[PDB]
Design a protein around this ligand. Structure first.
Ligand SMILES: [Mn+2]
Ligand SMILES: [Mn+2]
Length: 440
């Protein structure tokens, strides 16, 4: 699945629609990033730029100009085609194929941007710019405006009003279209298949990074070349570290292993977290902590729908965590009192949900304490967890236990759709899965 050319145009129009007459929106592409010396990291396009263009190239600037309520055109600045640069690095689009390929009106050379941009801005009243996003962008836009302020003798005028378009654009990215939901849906299946794979390959003696390998390979097998974020494979005490990415330790029999890994498919992120026994059989202590986290997840999945909020559902989860923690001796006291004093924080110290989209931790306003009312189109993760420090003053059997069980969902008109439910989470199911795999 993917975003059709019709859709990028629709997005560009949706933004233009909100623009004031006599203005221009400048959206810059992401700079190339060094990994070491004359080596660069696999290029990743700025998410906002990509959202409107789907163009995976550096040194590109999309300009949307709006004259009035029905008159608007677009200018794209991108790299000039060049034969030496194309024999070495990859094929470029160039100004000639650009207008047709990217659905833009005019396509100029990036090398000409400083000679061209001020001409495009001259005479307008407003210019939408994400000031501070990129330093190279700030230099360009500022000198275009300084040329305009300084050239009144040449009859040039600079738009006195600058407006950040991020709030507007991010508010748009917050609500997914059916096309996007279809992409994310695939991102979910791919990530789910990867998680199922790790569970089936896991054996005591294997290193944590080995499961990172199996996960990344499965991503690749379905056309998702890169992970949306750095893979977490924390076994034993490592599972207590939220973003444990070193994955350097040998997975031992008896310990649990928490895998937090997601694929990047057509620019969209997949978040899945699954915790399971390295040996395929949960101990009673492990099962006791797991059940509380699983109930938090299952209940939240049941609760999430239009009308509620992340804050509201989180309350139901805190309640479940405290109740369960008291029953095991991890917490001591009256449930309602412990709740009121937020007694779960030393064990569950992060949010229950984040927006999900082009960025794992997607854009979009949450509202104070993430209280915003959920509406159809919003896509989020559902990820309860309990991390009992190795030196926590609680019954020994719970020390060094880290468990998270994260699903990705879409708020539908009546409830929500679970994009990552194709990878098992119930303990009997996880055990059955691992046992079936260990035959062969
Ligand atoms: Mn997440
Ligand atoms: Mn995650």
């Amino acid at each position: 699945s993917e975003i059709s050319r019709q859709e990028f145009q629709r997005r560009r129009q949706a933004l233009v629609e909100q623009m004031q007459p006599g203005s221009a929106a400048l959206i810059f592409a992401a700079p190339e990033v060094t990994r070491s010396a004359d080596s660069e990291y696999p290029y990743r396009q700025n998410s906002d730029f990509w959202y409107f263009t789907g163009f995976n190239e550096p040194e590109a600037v999309l300009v949307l100009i709006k004259s009035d309520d029905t008159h608007n055109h677009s200018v794209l600045f991108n790299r000039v085609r060049d034969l030496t640069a194309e024999i070495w690095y990859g094929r470029r689009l160039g100004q000639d194929a650009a207008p047709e390929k990217l659905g833009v009106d005019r396509a100029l050379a990036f090398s000409e941007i400083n000679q061209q941009l001020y001409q495009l801005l001259n005479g307008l009243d407003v210019v939408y710019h994400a000031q501070g996003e990129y330093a190279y962008a700030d230099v360009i836009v500022n000198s275009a405006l300084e040329k305009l302020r300084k050239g009144s003798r040449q009859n040039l005028t600079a738009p006195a009003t600058m407006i950040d378009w991020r709030p507007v654009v991010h508010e748009m990215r917050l609500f997914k279209s059916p096309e996007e939901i279809a992409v994310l849906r695939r991102a979910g299946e791919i990530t789910a298949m990867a998680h199922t794979r790790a569970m089936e390959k896991c054996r005591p003696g294997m290193f944590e990074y080995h499961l990172e390998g199996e996960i990344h390979h499965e991503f690749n097998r379905h056309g998702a070349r890169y992970p949306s974020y750095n893979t977490i494979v924390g076994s034993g005490e490592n599972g207590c570290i939220l973003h444990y990415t070193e994955n350097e330790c040998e997975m031992r029999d008896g310990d649990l292993v928490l895998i937090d890994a997601g694929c990047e498919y057509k620019g969209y992120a997949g978040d899945i977290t699954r915790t399971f026994p390295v040996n395929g059989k949960f101990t009673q202590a492990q099962r006791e902590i797991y059940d509380i986290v699983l109930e938090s997840l299952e209940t939240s999945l049941r609760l999430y729908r239009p009308g509620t909020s992340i804050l509201e559902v989180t309350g139901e989860v805190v309640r479940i965590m405290v109740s369960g923690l008291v029953k095991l001796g991890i917490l001591k006291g009256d449930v309602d009192e412990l709740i009121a004093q937020n007694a779960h924080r030393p064990f569950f110290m992060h949010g229950l949900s984040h927006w999900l989209g082009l960025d794992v931790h997607d854009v979009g306003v949450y509202g104070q304490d993430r209280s915003r009312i959920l509406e159809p189109g919003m896509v989020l993760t559902v990820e309860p967890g309990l991390y009992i420090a190795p030196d926590a003053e609680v019954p020994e059997q719970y020390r060094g236990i880290g468990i998270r069980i994260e699903d990705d969902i879409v708020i539908t008109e009546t409830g929500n759709e679970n994009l990552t439910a194709s990878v098992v989470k119930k303990p009997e199911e996880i055990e059955a899965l691992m046992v079936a795999a260990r035959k062969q």
